[PDB]
Design an enzyme around this catalytic site. Structure first.
Site, PDB file in Angstrom:
ATOM      1  N   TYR A 102       0.883  -1.537   0.133  1.00  0.00           N
ATOM      2  CA  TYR A 102       0.311  -0.140   0.065  1.00  0.00           C
ATOM      3  C   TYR A 102       0.679   0.848   0.102  1.00  0.00           C
ATOM      4  O   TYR A 102       1.800   1.344   0.616  1.00  0.00           O
ATOM      5  CB  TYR A 102      -0.658  -0.115   0.645  1.00  0.00           C
ATOM      6  CG  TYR A 102       0.283  -0.211   2.555  1.00  0.00           C
ATOM      7  CD1 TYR A 102      -0.200   1.745   3.150  1.00  0.00           C
ATOM      8  CD2 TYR A 102       0.520  -0.704   2.887  1.00  0.00           C
ATOM      9  CE1 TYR A 102       0.392   1.683   3.889  1.00  0.00           C
ATOM     10  CE2 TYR A 102       0.946  -0.834   4.331  1.00  0.00           C
ATOM     11  CZ  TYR A 102       1.468   0.543   5.222  1.00  0.00           C
ATOM     12  OH  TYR A 102       1.860   0.839   6.311  1.00  0.00           O
ATOM     13  N   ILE A 131      -8.352  -0.421  10.070  1.00  0.00           N
ATOM     14  CA  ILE A 131      -9.163   0.507   9.755  1.00  0.00           C
ATOM     15  C   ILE A 131     -10.255   0.000   9.268  1.00  0.00           C
ATOM     16  O   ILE A 131      -9.925  -0.884   8.569  1.00  0.00           O
ATOM     17  CB  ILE A 131      -8.848   2.488   9.416  1.00  0.00           C
ATOM     18  CG1 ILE A 131      -7.860   1.671   7.886  1.00  0.00           C
ATOM     19  CG2 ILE A 131      -7.803   2.802  10.284  1.00  0.00           C
ATOM     20  CD1 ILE A 131      -7.331   3.180   6.878  1.00  0.00           C
ATOM     21  N   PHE A 190       1.834   9.625   3.633  1.00  0.00           N
ATOM     22  CA  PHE A 190       2.858   9.702   4.855  1.00  0.00           C
ATOM     23  C   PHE A 190       3.059   8.262   4.777  1.00  0.00           C
ATOM     24  O   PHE A 190       3.939   8.276   6.005  1.00  0.00           O
ATOM     25  CB  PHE A 190       1.352   9.789   5.643  1.00  0.00           C
ATOM     26  CG  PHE A 190       0.259   9.139   5.934  1.00  0.00           C
ATOM     27  CD1 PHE A 190       0.219   8.191   5.832  1.00  0.00           C
ATOM     28  CD2 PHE A 190      -1.392   9.898   4.847  1.00  0.00           C
ATOM     29  CE1 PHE A 190      -1.024   7.274   5.962  1.00  0.00           C
ATOM     30  CE2 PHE A 190      -1.867   8.440   4.598  1.00  0.00           C
ATOM     31  CZ  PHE A 190      -1.781   7.091   5.188  1.00  0.00           C
ATOM     32  N   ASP A 191       3.053   7.135   3.886  1.00  0.00           N
ATOM     33  CA  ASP A 191       3.675   5.839   4.273  1.00  0.00           C
ATOM     34  C   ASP A 191       3.327   5.208   3.617  1.00  0.00           C
ATOM     35  O   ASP A 191       2.774   5.131   2.804  1.00  0.00           O
ATOM     36  CB  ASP A 191       3.023   5.301   5.639  1.00  0.00           C
ATOM     37  CG  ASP A 191       3.090   4.272   6.152  1.00  0.00           C
ATOM     38  OD1 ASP A 191       4.360   3.207   5.871  1.00  0.00           O
ATOM     39  OD2 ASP A 191       2.008   3.220   6.374  1.00  0.00           O
ATOM     40  N   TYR A 239      -8.889   7.006  11.207  1.00  0.00           N
ATOM     41  CA  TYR A 239      -8.872   7.553  12.326  1.00  0.00           C
ATOM     42  C   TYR A 239     -10.051   8.335  13.314  1.00  0.00           C
ATOM     43  O   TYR A 239      -9.873   8.657  14.296  1.00  0.00           O
ATOM     44  CB  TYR A 239      -7.055   7.713  12.717  1.00  0.00           C
ATOM     45  CG  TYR A 239      -6.123   6.691  12.271  1.00  0.00           C
ATOM     46  CD1 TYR A 239      -6.053   6.764  11.030  1.00  0.00           C
ATOM     47  CD2 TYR A 239      -5.941   5.243  13.065  1.00  0.00           C
ATOM     48  CE1 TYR A 239      -4.452   5.857  10.878  1.00  0.00           C
ATOM     49  CE2 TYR A 239      -5.215   4.390  12.371  1.00  0.00           C
ATOM     50  CZ  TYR A 239      -4.743   4.417  11.191  1.00  0.00           C
ATOM     51  OH  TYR A 239      -4.060   2.987  11.157  1.00  0.00           O
ATOM     52  N   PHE A 290      -5.669   5.608  -0.635  1.00  0.00           N
ATOM     53  CA  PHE A 290      -3.907   4.741  -0.734  1.00  0.00           C
ATOM     54  C   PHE A 290      -4.388   4.399  -1.486  1.00  0.00           C
ATOM     55  O   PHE A 290      -5.585   3.475  -1.931  1.00  0.00           O
ATOM     56  CB  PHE A 290      -5.526   3.488   0.629  1.00  0.00           C
ATOM     57  CG  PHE A 290      -4.668   3.746   2.032  1.00  0.00           C
ATOM     58  CD1 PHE A 290      -3.256   3.733   2.402  1.00  0.00           C
ATOM     59  CD2 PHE A 290      -5.708   4.118   3.168  1.00  0.00           C
ATOM     60  CE1 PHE A 290      -3.179   4.049   4.376  1.00  0.00           C
ATOM     61  CE2 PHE A 290      -5.540   4.714   3.448  1.00  0.00           C
ATOM     62  CZ  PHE A 290      -4.255   4.761   4.328  1.00  0.00           C
TER      63      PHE A 290
END
Length: 117
Positions: free
Chosen positions: A36, A66, A46-47, A92, A109
């Site tokens: 992902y 999530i 961010f990731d 979140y 995502f």
């Protein structure tokens, strides 16, 4: 593709980037492996598991990720790569994840469903 709604309110949604290798979808309880990339709605990354080179593994439908991932990955076929818009109430919520996600964030995502067992 155009946006495909996943949730009943249609706010959790995806675009299919690469169609899956088959029509198989993972049942609840599957240990799924995904790659992902997560970005904010600015496009700021961010990731990403691709930066680490190791897929992320979780048990589908356990609520240990999530809600947008439990619902979104359930919608995916084996090998599918899709792009998800995940509202904060599917992610979140009002929480911040320090150093990762600001409070009350819609999350984008790219998710590739690699396999499961």
């Amino acid at each position: 593709t155009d946006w495909i709604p996943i949730s009943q309110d249609q706010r959790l949604k995806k675009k299919i980037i690469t169609a899956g290798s088959s029509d198989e979808q993972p049942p609840i309880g599957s240990k799924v492996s995904v790659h992902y990339t997560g970005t904010l709605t600015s496009g700021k990354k961010f990731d990403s598991s691709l930066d680490r080179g190791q897929p992320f593994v979780f048990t589908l439908g356990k609520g240990e990720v999530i809600r947008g991932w439990d619902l979104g990955v359930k919608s995916m076929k084996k090998g599918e790569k899709s792009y998800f818009e995940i509202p904060s109430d599917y992610a979140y919520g009002n929480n911040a994840i320090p150093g990762l996600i600001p409070a009350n964030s819609t999350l984008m995502f790219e998710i590739e469903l690699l396999s499961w067992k």
